[model samples]
Target: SPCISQPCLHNGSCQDSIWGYTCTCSPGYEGSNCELAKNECHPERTDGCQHFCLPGQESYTCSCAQGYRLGEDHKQCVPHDQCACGVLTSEKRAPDLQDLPWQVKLTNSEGKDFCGGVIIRENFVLTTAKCSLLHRNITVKTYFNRTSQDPLMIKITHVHVHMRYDADAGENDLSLLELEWPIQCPGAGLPVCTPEKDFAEHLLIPRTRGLLSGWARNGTDLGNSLTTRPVTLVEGEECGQVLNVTVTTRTYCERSSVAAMHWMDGSVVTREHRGSWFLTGVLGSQPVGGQAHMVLVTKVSRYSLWFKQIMN
Candidate 1:
């Protein structure tokens, strides 16, 4: 019998159970006597649970039962699904004259801009090792026309990634880019052939696909700029259950939230360039509302000598 008159406001803390008073609001205040306050319904929350706000002792509502509408940041109650809105459709493909291999554009040494690589020999080049960390002067530009806005730059000096590579469980994100000079490939559009550790016996055969391309920056909306896509490998136990990673790998790739251009279709795959598409496994750990397939490559034939001694 504690039905006092402070009736739980801001300092919320009342209790007279059995039939009435029960306000224990503090972590943000609720109702039923807590006097109602709780807001931030989802506060632009980036996907975790679409709807579920069960707080009530003083005065808290919004289980969103009628028509649902708390998204823009009132705190997620979205359930119009309505095809989940739209505008992310751009499959993006083009650049596969047998894998048009070598196409670089990485930078560092305070030059900033760091990402986009491919070219497997003529002194290696393959990217994503957290996009080759911190500055030390790295520039590797090679483009026959990477969407050309004025593309044609070649300057490689050395930039390696994959020192056991983890980037928080991306595990061996691979990286071996070294080229102080030697760069020449036109006919047959060469370079791009790195798989010989028996190439996993032709990659366990079964209609292989592994082919990828990249420019980077597609989703998760980071300032957003660079974009290039050409994916096709998918297996690694469905990319470890879309990256919950219990440790599964027929060689990865199996996540998909579904948007493609407006961005948010997290994990896509296609690996099958046997002789060399090394370490094809990336796209994992996603499902917050899902949609972030920026770059998730895979094909590291059992860690080729630990990624060539961590990129020699």
Candidate 2:
């Protein structure tokens, strides 16, 4: 028999048959005689890999380059943002109730937390224009903690509301409050990053969740301290049909309990990427006819250009 000669190469099992010998190749061997080594890293193979290709026994895997991460497609790479945003300054790395550094409360002269705002820069806080308009004498309070004694407050020097903000439809509802003095970092407050225009698309990964932090509503009363909860994005079209407002690409939706949705307005929606937190959306007021379960959020990417123009 052909098996008597052990003609199979690379430790392949040889089986004698009517037509010569059948060779079952090893894990990394191929060919009839098992003489050929399978190398997926061959130069001729055009895998369309966005980055480095690592060859396995009989297949290949893609890996990202330095400072880049592999996209969900497995064929593309995503770059990390340059700015160091959305990280803890204290020695404790564990994320606790007081972990959110960009959260601030927009209060009035009598120390009433009217709305929530996100610290976008050392001296700039982003909140809803409607909230700013309702209260002119707003003080931005930072580092809200129940245990901590008085949270620091900064006076608003200027209120820069979006030029085309539609008060009626709640469209382009954004206001940037400039502080008289820049917030002291390494203490508690840090500016949340405004990512690239298309960064929101990258963030909409399947099943990925974001944080909505602000003065959540307690039973019959607004929350005394800052609160946060996990929320997932709902489709704009679906939300629009239910809300009756034209929820365009500029806006999105998130489902939360009735207790928290109302007070969460004018807050911020943040997502973590590469160890940094990015301000994805600004929680706007509920549409004229909308469900209590779902609250609207103003997509930040749509106004990235406006942010640059105003901030600069």
Candidate 3:
């Protein structure tokens, strides 16, 4: 019978040699005496899985060859796809500023307060539910530019808030306002793109970038003065858990302290901390002691049809 010693600590098995004893290390372990060492070419240790490995003792290190990144999983190195290799080449086109449609401002009939909304169609004003609810009596004012006075005032014959709108959770806190008549304004913004159920089924990842513009108060010392800014879409996961909207179903807006201060700068402020200023999202409350200053807006892409059905 072959003589064997105790099991090797580094996953090695000791065996008897003809003259003495020897040790056999596992695939990842090495050393002349079957001692643990480094794996220079270990996938996890390399930049990406691009190279080979020289066996060492007990451990492994990666040696990436070139143009590869060790994926997050770290099992293999992947080729860097940033380089345009064998891909169609074309002149980089400048962002078509024209692609963005014109933003319109909505005000109450009394013309005392204001809110922001998008021109989805010739006749509809898509805005926050709180905006319409607060100024239920005033007619909505629509404008083309930020500084434009004398905006076209239209009566909101009907209002529809989301069925799932929760004042507490702030979930689905959206609404649509129907104008008495469609304002035939040219060069208005385009309608939001709707998700095709078929395309969504193919696992085709749609580009998530969107621009949100509003005529709410500016973030400067101007105080209570309105300004317009475009906010890009933020991933739902990245937004803290306080925001409980589904990532796939909703988009978020980012606001700074300066912006929030401008929002809450004055007394007689409706909706607590400037809540009536046509903002989006309901669950995200302000932080204690004025710590929660910034604001966030969720787009209406998730509930467009419901908007049309109710508003129309």
Number of the top lDDT candidate: 2
TM-score of 3: 0.46
Q: Would you list the C-alpha lDDT of every candidate in the order shown?
A: 0.45, 0.70, 0.41
Off by over 4 Å in 1: 1-139, 142-150, 165-173, 176-252, 255-312
Please state the error at residue 225 of candidate 2 in Å.
3.0
lDDT of 3 by residue, 182-211 (tens): 654332222222222222112112222222
1 or 3, greater by TM-score: 3
Quantify how close model 3 is to the true structure by its C-alpha RMSD in Å: 16.8
Please give the RMSD to the true structure for each candidate, in Å: 18.4, 10.7, 16.8
Could you estimate the TM-score for every candidate? 0.25, 0.67, 0.46
Tens-digit lDDT track of model 2 for 230-308: 7788877687788877776678888766444456566777776545566888888765564666777888878877877
Give the worst 10-residue stretch by lDDT in candidate 1: 81-90
Candidate 3 local Cα displacement, residue 267, angstroms: 21
Give the candidate number with the greatest TM-score. Answer: 2
Which wins on TM-score, candidate 2 or candidate 3?
Answer: 2
Note the clash tally of each candidate: 46, 1, 21
